[PDB]
Amino acid sequence: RLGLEAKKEENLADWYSQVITKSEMIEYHDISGCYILRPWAYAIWEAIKDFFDAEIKKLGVENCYFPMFVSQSALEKEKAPEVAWVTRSGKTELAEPIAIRPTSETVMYPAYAKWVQSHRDLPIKLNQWCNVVRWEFKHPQPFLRTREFLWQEGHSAFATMEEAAEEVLQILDLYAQVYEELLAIPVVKGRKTEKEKFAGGDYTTTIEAFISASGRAIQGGTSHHLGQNFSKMFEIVFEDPKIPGEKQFAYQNSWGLTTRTIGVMTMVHGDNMGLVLPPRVACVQVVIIPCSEEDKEALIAKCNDYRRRLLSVNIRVRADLRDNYSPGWKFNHWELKGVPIRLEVGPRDMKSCQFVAVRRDTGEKLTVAENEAETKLQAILEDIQVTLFTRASEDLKTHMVVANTMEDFQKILDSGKIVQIPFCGEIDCEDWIKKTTARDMGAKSLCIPFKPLCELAKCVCGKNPAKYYTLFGRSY
Amino acid sequence: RLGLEAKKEENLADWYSQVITKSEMIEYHDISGCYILRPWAYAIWEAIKDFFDAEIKKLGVENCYFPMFVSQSALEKEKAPEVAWVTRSGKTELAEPIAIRPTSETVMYPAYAKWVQSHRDLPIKLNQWCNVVRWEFKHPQPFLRTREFLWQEGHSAFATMEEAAEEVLQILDLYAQVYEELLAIPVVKGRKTEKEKFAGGDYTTTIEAFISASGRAIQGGTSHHLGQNFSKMFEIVFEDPKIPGEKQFAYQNSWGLTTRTIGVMTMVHGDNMGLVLPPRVACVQVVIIPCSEEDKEALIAKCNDYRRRLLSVNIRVRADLRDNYSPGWKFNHWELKGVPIRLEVGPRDMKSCQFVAVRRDTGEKLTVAENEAETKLQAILEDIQVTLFTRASEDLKTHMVVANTMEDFQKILDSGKIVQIPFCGEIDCEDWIKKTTARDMGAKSLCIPFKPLCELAKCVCGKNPAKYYTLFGRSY
Numbered sequence A, B: 001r002l003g004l005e006a007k008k009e010e011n012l013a014d015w016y017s018q019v020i021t022k023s024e025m026i027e028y029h030d031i032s033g034c035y036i037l038r039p040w041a042y043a044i045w046e047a048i049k050d051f052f053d054a055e056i057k058k059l060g061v062e063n064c065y066f067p068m069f070v071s072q073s074a075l076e077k078e079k080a081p082e083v084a085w086v087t088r089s090g091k092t093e094l095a096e097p098i099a100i101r102p103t104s105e106t107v108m109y110p111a112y113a114k115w116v117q118s119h120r121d122l123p124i125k126l127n128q129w130c131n132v133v134r135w136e137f138k139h140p141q142p143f144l145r146t147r148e149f150l151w152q153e154g155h156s157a158f159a160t161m162e163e164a165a166e167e168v169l170q171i172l173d174l175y176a177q178v179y180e181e182l183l184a185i186p187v188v189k190g191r192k193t194e195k196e197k198f199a200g201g202d203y204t205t206t207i208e209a210f211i212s213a214s215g216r217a218i219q220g221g222t223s224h225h226l227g228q229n230f231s232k233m234f235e236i237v238f239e240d241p242k243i244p245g246e247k248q249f250a251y252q253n254s255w256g257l258t259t260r261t262i263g264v265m266t267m268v269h270g271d272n273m274g275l276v277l278p279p280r281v282a283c284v285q286v287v288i289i290p291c292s293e294e295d296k297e298a299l300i301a302k303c304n305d306y307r308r309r310l311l312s313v314n315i316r317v318r319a320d321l322r323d324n325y326s327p328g329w330k331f332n333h334w335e336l337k338g339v340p341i342r343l344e345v346g347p348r349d350m351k352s353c354q355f356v357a358v359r360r361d362t363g364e365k366l367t368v369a370e371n372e373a374e375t376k377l378q379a380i381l382e383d384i385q386v387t388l389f390t391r392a393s394e395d396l397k398t399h400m401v402v403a404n405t406m407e408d409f410q411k412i413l414d415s416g417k418i419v420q421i422p423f424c425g426e427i428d429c430e431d432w433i434k435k436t437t438a439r440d441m442g443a444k445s446l447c448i449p450f451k452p453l454c455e456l457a458k459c460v461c462g463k464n465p466a467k468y469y470t471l472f473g474r475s476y
């Protein structure tokens, strides 16, 4: 089949499966929940990596790599169902089983304890780009809920809570920046409830994205304040410089962002014609397509001219000069892959000193003169990035509203919206909301937003007063 | 202890353990054969990555990521003792065991078969930067023989053997370039014998390095011609464009280089004062050390002046302005870490418009005027990189000689040298050489060099004639 079959509003699952394969991003594997990242998908991850990696180095974070294997002893200092266990090498069984990391707290922090003698050893700010395994036996999805996934995990240890408190929001803003400025995805910054917070953590901050096709929200990336909980388990301690004899535990953060990003990018921006790449993230921003043997070679020459002219303005461009494929095949092919701009030039356009420039987001065919080629296209790329963010941003505002009763909350949820409600914060009430909304698949707490829409008031459960406005909704 | 205890010539094992820990490169882990890569070690890998990654993109290779998990079905298409097996997730056991990749041929090539319809789909040139597990139950060493290790693995598929034949040597030259131009390690390019070649491969080319302290050689990185062996196992086939009806198998290469690089860098260049970084690879090329409160702040100002002046010539520099450590502590500290140049400036030097510049390789203390600071230091950095390569290169020539009998071969081997001998290529003779040299730990074939010292003659075993001069020696 040439293009997509299922519409996004018709069958999101089929639509999603078709767009990720037809855009040459994903290939399926014979192990469930594991997917192959083809260059078109991996290039986006590299764009995210290059940005985020450069930004954390300004904050004084340094890259590293810890082992993928965790001892049982290390895991049970903290203490599971998602942890993959290696039990044999070849035919011979191991004396003791060894676990694949779902996260590296128990791997890294024993070494942190050895590196901390005094407060001058702090702060320690380390990051690693690696893979982790979480054997979640649900229905896995490419990018969004994968059994293996690439990510970064940062782990910081400080002398004071206040130092650690500032980094949490610094990192969370960098994640929002990755979602908003790179991927053009609007996000809601907030604190997780007690039920949804990171196990062993003091508090978890999160960025919540909204996938309007499902009417479901998704956790976009979290920054955790572990406090002194992990530094006690592994005895990360230093001499108190203010108090002669006493000993103080290190205040720790951990933070992580994954290849889920690419899945949210696909789900939000993608349309019924295929993938849609934000220019800031697209490895190919512009694709040049040629539209007598001498006249054919002249058409090739014009394309190589436009190619190198765009490279001189650092615009990531590629010329598709393969003569084995027709122009019509190329338009559709690069449509599916979601290249922001198709630079189209035919015999008549070449003669008239111009070319057709097709925007991927709108489908607008703009005729630009050869002299205004490199100034206009970057203006178009910027407008594509802005159009994508604005469209999605307003899509979020429209689908996020306030409700003060469980009755109004239910109907708003049924319309495919997420909604902020007066909430006490207690976990028994949170389970009741999931239970009641499922019977009337259940709605979960997404985050307690830093900037809520309205201000406080009885709780939705109607037993005790409300502590804060909390964002609820159906979720991935 | 302030510095190293064991001498390199005295106890290489203790020396190696002390230099990797005292230079803050390695930290030990509670799983045998697995080691923590601290920033100082990881930064070198990043330098190698940035170079190699940029170079293969010029050749038209694209990055990707395949799953770490391999099905049993996929492994036995090719067909083991080194393969780690996952058998349970949490408390519940998996229906079928799943293996951790020691290499990704069986993971990638089923997908390659699906992507190849016709010859226009070829060539496919893919690379991935990832971790792999080889549960080798020997005595593991940090960097050199690790149970988990970071690497890159490239996998290419072509229409013709000749295309694949050119890439093999292109990639091998890039590995030599990584060893010689980045790490300043001299290497011997050669073809592996039939015994040592990659299982399922047509032929393996290799770069052999020499660690003079042991008198042992080590495999530095290999580029393999898999031929049609793997494309038959997984049915990677396309329509023959020259022959109407017949069907042709894809000609494949695979190639890999690992964090072993850093181990060979440490073993070759390191001395009895600690690590020695080649300037091209050092994340800190120059370290500035300060040597009345107003006069102290003036000394700090001069250091920040030199710092930013070196950043303006893109020299990677850091100022160690920590007042909690003494100058003497800093000299030794950065000596152990092997920073090419210690830029030292004291009160008297500041007054005289000059500074002491200490080379790490030689220990030469050069006084450079403040005006000639940024032109001379880059000349010094270049001379350090050249001095390291030349010293090591001649170290190799001196320890690599020719022998024509088994008698002379034995004594030359006992002097701690590697030696090229007349060899037929057969595996029974190769085992006899390992057996005889062990009793008189055994010597193995290293490579059949492309540029041998001498030219052909009976074999060393003395049964049949010799086919080629082959490099033998004790090995890691």
Ligand SMILES: Nc1ncnc2c1ncn2[C@@H]1O[C@H](COS(=O)(=O)NC(=O)[C@@H]2CCN2)[C@@H](O)[C@H]1O
Residues within 6 Å of the ligand: A102, A103, A104, A105, A134, A136, A143, A144, A145, A146, A147, A149, A153, A154, A198, A219, A220, A221, A222, A224, A254, A255, A256, A257, A258, A259, A260
């Ligand atoms: N199965 C998954 N597939 C893809 N991404 C996943 C999956 N599970 C969680 N994530 C994403 O990882 C992010 C970070 O995971 S996290 O559990 O919230 N945090 C940690 O593990 C911290 C960092 C080191 N310890 C989440 O925000 C979520 O978006």
Ligand SMILES: Nc1ncnc2c1ncn2[C@@H]1O[C@H](COS(=O)(=O)NC(=O)[C@@H]2CCN2)[C@@H](O)[C@H]1O
Residues within 6 Å of the ligand: B102, B103, B104, B105, B134, B136, B143, B144, B145, B146, B147, B149, B153, B154, B198, B219, B220, B221, B222, B224, B254, B255, B256, B257, B258, B259, B260
């Ligand atoms: N245990 C090891 N630790 C560190 N490096 C190791 C270890 N075993 C092999 N190596 C290094 O990997 C290199 C590549 O490994 S290789 O076996 O020679 N080749 C492959 O696996 C090919 C690439 C994809 N399939 C070797 O040259 C060797 O120097």
Ligand SMILES: [Zn+2]
Residues within 6 Å of the ligand: A423, A424, A425, A426, A429, A459, A460, A461, A462, A463, A464
């Ligand atoms: Zn309540």
Ligand SMILES: [Zn+2]
Residues within 6 Å of the ligand: B423, B424, B425, B426, B429, B459, B460, B461, B462, B463, B464
């Ligand atoms: Zn022989």
